[PDB]
Amino acid sequence: MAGVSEYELPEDPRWELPRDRLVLGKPLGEGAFGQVVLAEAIGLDKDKPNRVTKVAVKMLKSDATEKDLSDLISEMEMMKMIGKHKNIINLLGACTQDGPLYVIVEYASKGNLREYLQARRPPGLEYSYNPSHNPEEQLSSKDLVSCAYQVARGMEYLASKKCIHRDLAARNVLVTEDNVMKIADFGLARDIHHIDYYKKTNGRLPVKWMAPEALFDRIYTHQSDVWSFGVLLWEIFTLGGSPYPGVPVEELFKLLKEGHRMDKPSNCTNELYMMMRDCWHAVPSQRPTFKQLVEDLDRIVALTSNQ
Numbered sequence: 070m071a072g073v074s075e076y077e078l079p080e081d082p083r084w085e086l087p088r089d090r091l092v093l094g095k096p097l098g099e100g101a102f103g104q105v106v107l108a109e110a111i112g113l114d115k116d117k118p119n120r121v122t123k124v125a126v127k128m129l130k131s132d133a134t135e136k137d138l139s140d141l142i143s144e145m146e147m148m149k150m151i152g153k154h155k156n157i158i159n160l161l162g163a164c165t166q167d168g169p170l171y172v173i174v175e176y177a178s179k180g181n182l183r184e185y186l187q188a189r190r191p192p193g194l195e196y197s198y199n200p201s202h203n204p205e206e207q208l209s210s211k212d213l214v215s216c217a218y219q220v221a222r223g224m225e226y227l228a229s230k231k232c233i234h235r236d237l238a239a240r241n242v243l244v245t246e247d248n249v250m251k252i253a254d255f256g257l258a259r260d261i262h263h264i265d266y267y268k269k270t271n272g273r274l275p276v277k278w279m280a281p282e283a284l285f286d287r288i289y290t291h292q293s294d295v296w297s298f299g300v301l302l303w304e305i306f307t308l309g310g311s312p313y314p315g316v317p318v319e320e321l322f323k324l325l326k327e328g329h330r331m332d333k334p335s336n337c338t339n340e341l342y343m344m345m346r347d348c349w350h351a352v353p354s355q356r357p358t359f360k361q362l363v364e365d366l367d368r369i370v371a372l373t374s375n376q
């Protein structure tokens with residue numbers, strides 16, 4: 070709410086970057102991650118001060134409150150503690166002095182996993198239509214399993230750092246220029262108020278990624294993330310399909326309790342569908358861990374054909 074000079078932003082010499090070392094560019098995400106722009110950073114690495122690096126910059130909106138500022142800081146500090154990994158969106162730096170708070174993170178040029186897969190939908194029969202006006206090359210069967218593997222690896226790391234995502238979905242996984250899967254928004258502050266089960270975002274309903282125990286009793290564990298990973302698996306092999314198609318929220322509550330699960334996608338092996346079902350086990354303690362998931366998916370990648 071108040072001016073940014075009215076507060077005391079935490080300075081960290083290890084991460085602090087002068088503002089004139091950033092060339093701000095076009096908006097990124099259409100604000101799914103909040104106000105984030107593309108930018109070029111000059112001498113992000115001290116060893117190469119004359120090198121330009123493409124980065125993503127998150128900042129507060131014009132209507133931001135004192136709460137929003139605290140959250141963005143908390144998000145930044147959380148990313149510091151969690152540390153680095155190949156398959157997450159990493160912290161690269163920050164601008165905390167002489168202006169608005171800037172949190173500098175890694176840039177993924179190919180958008181989120183959902184739109185990434187949809188644009189690479191074949192004009193065939195076992196997928197919905199390609200909605201992209203700029204379709205890219207189809208992905209092999211080993212590329213899809215590899216996508217799941219990388220996401221699992223990211224979550225395995227996050228879990229090892231006591232991090233619970235609470236909203237693992239294809240929309241929250243970003244794809245780099247080198248087709249590297251990176252998990253996004255894992256350091257978000259958990260809302261202290263009771264949840265609205267029918268809120269929108271695009272027109273996405275986050276309730277369809279929640280484990281039953283998180284849905285009904287608001288209990289979030291690593292096992293609830295495992296459930297979400299199952300839905301993410303289903304998203305991958307439908308190439309960006311919408312979970313529980315035609316099923317509204319009020320019907321989803323009843324269905325899940327009755328043991329109802331999504332059917333196997335048309336193009337999905339039985340082994341990979343069992344993995345989804347295992348992730349969608351009613352008992353949280355009976356779901357596989359991310360460590361186990363990474364091991365299985367590693368085996369499956371080696372056996373899956375890219376022809």
Ligand SMILES: COc1cc(CCc2cc(NC(=O)c3ccc(N4C[C@@H](C)N[C@@H](C)C4)cc3)[nH]n2)cc(OC)c1
Nearest residue numbers: 097098102125127158175176177178179180253254255
């Ligand atoms: C912890 O986690 C995060 C993640 C972020 C987000 C950072 C980010 C966002 C992006 N990237 C995009 O948002 C993006 C890029 C390309 C897109 N598209 C457009 C589409 C039409 N065509 C496609 C070919 C490409 C669509 C979206 N990178 N880094 C910020 C953050 O603050 C602290 C923390």
